[PDB]
Amino acid sequence: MLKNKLIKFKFFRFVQSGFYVDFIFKKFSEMFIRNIFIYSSIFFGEKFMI
Amino acid sequence: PLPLGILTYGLKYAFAGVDAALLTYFWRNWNFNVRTIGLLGGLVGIQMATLHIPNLVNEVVIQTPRRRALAKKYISAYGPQFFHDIVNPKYDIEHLRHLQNKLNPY
Amino acid sequence: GAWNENQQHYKYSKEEIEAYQVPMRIKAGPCVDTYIPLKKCFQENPTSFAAKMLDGRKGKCAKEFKYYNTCLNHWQTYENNSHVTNAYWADTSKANADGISNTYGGSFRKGLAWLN
Amino acid sequence: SSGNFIVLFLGWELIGLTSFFLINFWSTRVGTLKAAFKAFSFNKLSDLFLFFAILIIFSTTYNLDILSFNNQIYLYESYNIDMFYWSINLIEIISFFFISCAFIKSAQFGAHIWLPDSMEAPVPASALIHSATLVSAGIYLLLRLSPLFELSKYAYFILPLIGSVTAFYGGLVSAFQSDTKKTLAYSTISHCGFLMVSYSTGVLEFVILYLYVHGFFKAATFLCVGNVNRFNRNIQDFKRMGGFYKYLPFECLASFVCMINLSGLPLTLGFYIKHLLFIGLVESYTLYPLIFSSLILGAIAGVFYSYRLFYSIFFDTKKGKKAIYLQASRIILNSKFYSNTSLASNLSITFLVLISYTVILYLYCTTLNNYYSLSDLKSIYINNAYSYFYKPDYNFLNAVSILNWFVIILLISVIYLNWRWSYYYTKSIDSLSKFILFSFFFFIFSKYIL
Amino acid sequence: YLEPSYFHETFGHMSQPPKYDLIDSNINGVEKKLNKQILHREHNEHKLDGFVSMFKGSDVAK
Amino acid sequence: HGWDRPDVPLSFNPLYVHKRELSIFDTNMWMYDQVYPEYVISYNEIHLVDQWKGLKESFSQSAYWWAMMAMVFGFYFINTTPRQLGIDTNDLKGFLGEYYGQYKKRSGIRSNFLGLDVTGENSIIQPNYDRKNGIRDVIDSLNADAGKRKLINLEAKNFIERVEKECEQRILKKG
Amino acid sequence: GDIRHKFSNEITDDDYDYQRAMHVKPPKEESLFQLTNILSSVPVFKTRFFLDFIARNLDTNSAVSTSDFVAPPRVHENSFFVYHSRELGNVIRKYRSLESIVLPGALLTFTYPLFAAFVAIPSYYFMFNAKIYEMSRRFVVRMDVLPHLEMISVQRIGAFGILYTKLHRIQDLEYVPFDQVKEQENYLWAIGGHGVDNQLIFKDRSTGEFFYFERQGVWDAKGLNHPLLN
Amino acid sequence: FQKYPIPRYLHVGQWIVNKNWKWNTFHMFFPTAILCFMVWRNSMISTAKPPNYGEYVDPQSPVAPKAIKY
Amino acid sequence: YYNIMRQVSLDSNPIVLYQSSTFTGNGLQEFYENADALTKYLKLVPFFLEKNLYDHPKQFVIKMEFHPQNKVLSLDCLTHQGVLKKTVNLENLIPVPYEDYVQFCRRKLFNAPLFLDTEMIYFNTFQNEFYVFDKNAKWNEEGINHPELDISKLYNEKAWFDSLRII
Amino acid sequence: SGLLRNFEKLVCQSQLSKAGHKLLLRSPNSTLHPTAFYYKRNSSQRLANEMDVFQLGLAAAALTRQANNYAQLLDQV
Amino acid sequence: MSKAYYFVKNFSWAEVSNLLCYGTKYPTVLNHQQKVTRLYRATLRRVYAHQVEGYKTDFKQYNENITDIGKDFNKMLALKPESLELQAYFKKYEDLQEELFDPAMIIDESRPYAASSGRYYIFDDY
Numbered sequence A: 001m002l003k004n005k006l007i008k009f010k011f012f013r014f015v016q017s018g019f020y021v022d023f024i025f026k027k028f029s030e031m032f033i034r035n036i037f038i039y040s041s042i043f044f045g046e047k048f049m050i
Numbered sequence B: 001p002l003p004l005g006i007l008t009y010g011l012k013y014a015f016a017g018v019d020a021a022l023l024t025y026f027w028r029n030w031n032f033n034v035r036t037i038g039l040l041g042g043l044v045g046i047q048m049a050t051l052h053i054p055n056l057v058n059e060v061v062i063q064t065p066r067r068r069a070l071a072k073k074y075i076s077a078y079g080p081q082f083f084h085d086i087v088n089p090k091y092d093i094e095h096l097r098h099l100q101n102k103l104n105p106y
Numbered sequence C: 001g002a003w004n005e006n007q008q009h010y011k012y013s014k015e016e017i018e019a020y021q022v023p024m025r026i027k028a029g030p031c032v033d034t035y036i037p038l039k040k041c042f043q044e045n046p047t048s049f050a051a052k053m054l055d056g057r058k059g060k061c062a063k064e065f066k067y068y069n070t071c072l073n074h075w076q077t078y079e080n081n082s083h084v085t086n087a088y089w090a091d092t093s094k095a096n097a098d099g100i101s102n103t104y105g106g107s108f109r110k111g112l113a114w115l116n
Numbered sequence D: 001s002s003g004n005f006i007v008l009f010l011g012w013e014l015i016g017l018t019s020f021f022l023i024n025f026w027s028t029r030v031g032t033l034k035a036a037f038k039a040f041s042f043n044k045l046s047d048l049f050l051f052f053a054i055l056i057i058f059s060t061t062y063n064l065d066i067l068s069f070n071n072q073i074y075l076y077e078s079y080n081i082d083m084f085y086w087s088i089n090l091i092e093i094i095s096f097f098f099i100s101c102a103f104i105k106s107a108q109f110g111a112h113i114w115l116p117d118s119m120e121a122p123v124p125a126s127a128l129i130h131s132a133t134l135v136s137a138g139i140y141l142l143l144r145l146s147p148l149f150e151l152s153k154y155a156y157f158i159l160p161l162i163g164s165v166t167a168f169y170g171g172l173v174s175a176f177q178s179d180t181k182k183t184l185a186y187s188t189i190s191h192c193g194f195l196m197v198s199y200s201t202g203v204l205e206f207v208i209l210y211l212y213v214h215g216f217f218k219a220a221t222f223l224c225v226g227n228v229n230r231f232n233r234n235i236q237d238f239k240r241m242g243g244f245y246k247y248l249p250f251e252c253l254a255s256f257v258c259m260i261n262l263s264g265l266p267l268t269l270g271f272y273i274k275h276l277l278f279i280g281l282v283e284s285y286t287l288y289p290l291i292f293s294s295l296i297l298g299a300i301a302g303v304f305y306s307y308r309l310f311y312s313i314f315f316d317t318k319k320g321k322k323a324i325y326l327q328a329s330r331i332i333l334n335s336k337f338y339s340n341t342s343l344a345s346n347l348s349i350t351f352l353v354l355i356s357y358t359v360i361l362y363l364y365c366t367t368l369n370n371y372y373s374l375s376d377l378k379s380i381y382i383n384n385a386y387s388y389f390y391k392p393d394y395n396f397l398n399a400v401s402i403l404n405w406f407v408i409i410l411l412i413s414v415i416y417l418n419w420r421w422s423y424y425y426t427k428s429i430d431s432l433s434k435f436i437l438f439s440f441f442f443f444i445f446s447k448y449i450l
Numbered sequence E: 001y002l003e004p005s006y007f008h009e010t011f012g013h014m015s016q017p018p019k020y021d022l023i024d025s026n027i028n029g030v031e032k033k034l035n036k037q038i039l040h041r042e043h044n045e046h047k048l049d050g051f052v053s054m055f056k057g058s059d060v061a062k
Numbered sequence F: 001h002g003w004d005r006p007d008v009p010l011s012f013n014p015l016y017v018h019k020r021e022l023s024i025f026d027t028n029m030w031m032y033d034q035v036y037p038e039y040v041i042s043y044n045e046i047h048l049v050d051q052w053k054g055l056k057e058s059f060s061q062s063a064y065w066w067a068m069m070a071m072v073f074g075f076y077f078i079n080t081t082p083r084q085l086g087i088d089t090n091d092l093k094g095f096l097g098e099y100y101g102q103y104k105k106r107s108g109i110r111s112n113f114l115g116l117d118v119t120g121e122n123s124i125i126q127p128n129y130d131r132k133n134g135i136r137d138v139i140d141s142l143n144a145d146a147g148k149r150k151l152i153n154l155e156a157k158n159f160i161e162r163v164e165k166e167c168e169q170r171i172l173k174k175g
Numbered sequence G: 001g002d003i004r005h006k007f008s009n010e011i012t013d014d015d016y017d018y019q020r021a022m023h024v025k026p027p028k029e030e031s032l033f034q035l036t037n038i039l040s041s042v043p044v045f046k047t048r049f050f051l052d053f054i055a056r057n058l059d060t061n062s063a064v065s066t067s068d069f070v071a072p073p074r075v076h077e078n079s080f081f082v083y084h085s086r087e088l089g090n091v092i093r094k095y096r097s098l099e100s101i102v103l104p105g106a107l108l109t110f111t112y113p114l115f116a117a118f119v120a121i122p123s124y125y126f127m128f129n130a131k132i133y134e135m136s137r138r139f140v141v142r143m144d145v146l147p148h149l150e151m152i153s154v155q156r157i158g159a160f161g162i163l164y165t166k167l168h169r170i171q172d173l174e175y176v177p178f179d180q181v182k183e184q185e186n187y188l189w190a191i192g193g194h195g196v197d198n199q200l201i202f203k204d205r206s207t208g209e210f211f212y213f214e215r216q217g218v219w220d221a222k223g224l225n226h227p228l229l230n
Numbered sequence H: 001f002q003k004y005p006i007p008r009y010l011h012v013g014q015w016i017v018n019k020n021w022k023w024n025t026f027h028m029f030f031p032t033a034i035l036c037f038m039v040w041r042n043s044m045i046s047t048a049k050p051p052n053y054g055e056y057v058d059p060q061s062p063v064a065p066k067a068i069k070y
Numbered sequence I: 001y002y003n004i005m006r007q008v009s010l011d012s013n014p015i016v017l018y019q020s021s022t023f024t025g026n027g028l029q030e031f032y033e034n035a036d037a038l039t040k041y042l043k044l045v046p047f048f049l050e051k052n053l054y055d056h057p058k059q060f061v062i063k064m065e066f067h068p069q070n071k072v073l074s075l076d077c078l079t080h081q082g083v084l085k086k087t088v089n090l091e092n093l094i095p096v097p098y099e100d101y102v103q104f105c106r107r108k109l110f111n112a113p114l115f116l117d118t119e120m121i122y123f124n125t126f127q128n129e130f131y132v133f134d135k136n137a138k139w140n141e142e143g144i145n146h147p148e149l150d151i152s153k154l155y156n157e158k159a160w161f162d163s164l165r166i167i
Numbered sequence J: 001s002g003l004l005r006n007f008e009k010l011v012c013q014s015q016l017s018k019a020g021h022k023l024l025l026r027s028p029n030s031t032l033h034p035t036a037f038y039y040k041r042n043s044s045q046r047l048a049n050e051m052d053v054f055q056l057g058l059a060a061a062a063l064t065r066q067a068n069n070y071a072q073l074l075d076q077v
Numbered sequence K: 001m002s003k004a005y006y007f008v009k010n011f012s013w014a015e016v017s018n019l020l021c022y023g024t025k026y027p028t029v030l031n032h033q034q035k036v037t038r039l040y041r042a043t044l045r046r047v048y049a050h051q052v053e054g055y056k057t058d059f060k061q062y063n064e065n066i067t068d069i070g071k072d073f074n075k076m077l078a079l080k081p082e083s084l085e086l087q088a089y090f091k092k093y094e095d096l097q098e099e100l101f102d103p104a105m106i107i108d109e110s111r112p113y114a115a116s117s118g119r120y121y122i123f124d125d126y
């Protein structure tokens, strides 16, 4: 093979990033925090429901 | 015989490495001639003779005194007649397997 | 006679086995009888970890060591079926012809890499 | 040293609190506080799972003695608990809770994020946390409850795949990390995955040996990396490091020894542990192909990372700042006390390495010898996998040969790959060709000629 | 050195150094030849008996 | 050395002047600190835009490693045969025998010791003598493997006996 | 700026002699166990036979370079030598000649040639061909300009260590941009693009042939400054 | 880091060095050792150890675990 | 940068600028005749071994001429095979240090003999080979101080400092 | 480079470095004449359309030489 | 002394790119020559961060890339701000930087929001 797709820094960055598992989990946790604590709990829970 | 030691294993490995280096020098430089072939054969023969020599030297020097002492101890314990009868080809290996060693505590 | 049988061929009671502090792994196996004398000799004859890992004939505990070695070889060959395994590995054609083990030969595929 | 289920929970809580406080070394820095909070959340989740499992066990038996529970875990195997609309087996739920709690502590897929981010702690703190304790909690917890984990179908399917995947991921991540702390953490994650896979094998001795060897070697490597970072002014990335071998000979030699031992390299305790782990694999797994692939991939990845770290820190180009080297390169500092590290640290490292080697030798003598000197493992399920260690066939020999051949191919590739142009690039090719030819000649002569 | 099974796996089981007792020369004559033949037959029969025992010694423990 | 360096400047902990209103809509979403306050979570992979885009990119890149794993698995499966592993065959009454004994005991279906007429079934965690699920299938598979290994050993012994008898007969047949 | 003379117990230079095994230093003294001292002391080396063997073995004096300008032998009658490989070409030929022995030697010496193939196939496909095999394939060992056919006679290496010379149209030669041939041959240029000058690569357009010259190759000014080569 | 002034009024433990550390260490080691000995005695008062090697538990002794008699 | 080969000649009256004092003789036989030169050659056998087995391109210069008319060097070095004369482009020779020469060989060379002036390595980049003179030698002050050998005519910063680099 | 071997046949680098020497290299598989380079029948177009002057002339001369050889062999048929 | 809040604040990818190229999330506030100089300096730093320091360096390749970048930057600087070629060159340099976007970039302690920053609490004379 004359060209290796695994030789580019993009592949290197993706591998060193742990397959972006940290990014995915952090985005999901941020979405949960935004939707639950502020929106669902404090706003819909305390301001509205309570 | 005693087990082969670091010296013997290293001698064998060094002979193999010297042969490998000579073969690399030959093939890489394409220096293959009748004189080189004869020298390689002679080196292989000398290495084999020397490898047989260390085993002979070790075996002789170690075992021969130890073997003589062990035989002398067993000669007084069992007997030259028993030893010769064991050496006689007329002995039966079936009974020899069932024979008890008087110096075996078990 | 038996490979697992000790030189004196005596059976050790559960109380004696627990008194011998034999490992549960050894107790699981069928070679307890020979391991009892070897364990007794080793406890009675202390040897360092370097000594035991370095001694080839196990020092004084020699006959018990040989008996335990035979018993353990038999146990490990039977539990791994390594006998028929090596037999079929030596010659797949001969094992299939002789019908040594129908179950072993029926799924015997040496593999292309391992000399086809 | 837990003796009761309350003691285990107290120990887990204490370990969590100690990790939370230790990670917060620079309390004035709020950046590390985020990692500390993430670690605290993970520990709290693990503690909650453990508390739920302990509550279920107590509701089942009303006995907090761990020894009695292990001696009585086989009693209620044929039972179920009506949770919501489902009815799962009694052992299944407790085993799942214990396995999840261990995976939270012993870094696994989805729960290993806090392990890499935990590098904000000091060098000795990271050495202690990563090598054992926080990393060894899961293995110790699983081993303590060995009989309970024996009869769990969920554990049976979960442990092998999870362990292999985690080991492979950790190895691949360590193969791409330039930061010494990050590379070490990823290698530790790979080692934890391998230890979990070994726990799935059902043989405790291999797990214990792997734990001891991995902990000792990781501690040594972490100490060396911390010393290098201290010389580099708290810089952990190897991309801005180079030429430190001349600055720190002791550190270079210790790092070489530690990387040789830890990376699973052939002809060492790591090689023995890898062979033992590969011996005891069972072939009844539904996902056997992926499991085997992940195990091989995670086994092969350590050497590349170790060699890369060693060469970059010690024998690469001067990628470090001119200040780091030149400031200590002044002629005035030349005296009988010149040293880039501390003599006390170097002596501690040497003594720890010697003691670890002696202890590993003693453990191998007690376990790996012909006579099993191990005490009773309190396990009633003994596999026949020890037969292969005592007497295997030529098939396992050829498999191990294939693995060693992959390792040798990787070593050759890392030895001669010309990633950059050089004055000896052609000379490197000539050297590699000469090595191949000499190796072929030696293989021919040593086995057939003599 | 003490664990060359790793070398026996990847590089195979190479040629070992010449290990022999060479002690049968203690005596001389056709008796020595008969003893050597008996020893060779004993080694072959030991291999055969080991095969037979390892094949039949599976039912010793029940 | 060589320069009387002053005390550590107070600028090492600069004071942050909040230029934007910390709206209650982001309560606890930013870690507040008098020097260098930060966001609650860190996304060092900001090159990836969104969680869906990041997941798509990660799944696209992981295909090469998945294919490498598949190649390794194929190279192993096309060059190896199934091994002979299982529970210790000499011990059938341990982890294996105890399971069948407990399944044949069913002591959790007996009457109360004091005549309370309440059995193990009268519980949220109630005994069930006919589960036949979970680890029971794995136990059955292990028992089948042990039986197959024992049958293989017995067949090997029988075949060796047959070979020895045939050799004896052929040696006797020649006369 | 050392102050070692001020203090007595300070480490001395004579003490720092064990560091020579790892730190390169200019020669200060020759050791008793030094190879040079062993050679210059033993009267066995003073024998005439040893000197004769030393003068008449190993490398010969004839093949050693003696000028900054060299002229290789003539491939044809009216051709003009332009470029020639000096050491890289020899090393490539030696590497390609390894398969002339190892492939038969392994075939006659490996218990599992099938295993050897199953191992080496990815090594060639993923690691070796892009490193050595394809580099030697694109390597131009010798290049001369035949004026009669107005062509280029180029001799290059072949898989089993062979030599092969072909004539290509000068009008079919085009300058290959490294950027134009960067990505499609990335790994080839990454792992083994070090030995050839990416700033000077030619291409015969007739069959899509890529011609690469060594960065350390020897170029003749007379051939370069010819009407055929502009 | 280069040491910087700290408030003398602040009860901080930042790089605090005591000249009389030897006597304080000796005093905090000795009574602690005595307390540790007392606690060790208290803990060893109630201990359980596995039976000695070569000693088998005869089931007729009360030391063997008992069953609740209905 | 480019290895363009151009034919050169000899001035026919080259100025002898340096001749090794110890290595005085017609060739190998003459050196064998002299006892001290024989010991020096025995020490230089490690240099020959390094050049051949360790693949170190290097020459032990024993004599030299300079042809400023052809801008050429006419050195005459010694090796295990005998005396070899070398013609070098004056633009193809550059100074180099002992550490650079030693590290030029990736393998570890043998113990050095004292007969080498470590500070005066001379690299022929066109041939890419190092050269070391003899410590015991006579150098012509006028021969070296000719206008052709001036650093202004020879020393180029790029070739001198960065052409030979090992990473 | 060689042990216990004579380098009598090897060409001296002193002779090699001289411009205008009578050194000629004979290499294996060296095609010094493109006789078959431009030989092609059943062309989709004309030979002049497919081939240029040089190749066309070389191929024409090769065909003429082949025909001459065949005719010379035909005198003893 | 740049505030290394690249991964410390919830900034978008465009914000990160703007901070990398011109140092400001609103590079439109920068002038023509100022923006060109900032882009050239950032590109040089990022190139040295991958070709002068990294896994395996090549000095000649680094020098060649530096010469090419210098030629491009001179062309951009001598061009008009309201030129398609200048905007294209700016886009090319930004895309080159984005391709070199390393999440685990080395942050020097001299940065305001650095990893080693905030290690100690300095007490004032008050």
Ligand SMILES: Nc1ncnc2c1ncn2[C@@H]1O[C@H](COP(=O)(O)OP(=O)(O)O)[C@@H](O)[C@H]1O
Pocket (backbone or CB within 6 Å): F017, F018, F019, F020, F021, F022, F023, K003, K005, K009, K010
């Ligand atoms: N209270 C807040 N509300 C909204 N955004 C904020 C707040 N505090 C910080 N940020 C974000 O954090 C980043 C850091 O801002 P800062 O560095 O203080 O401003 P500047 O860059 O002008 O000095 C800003 O881009 C801003 O978007």
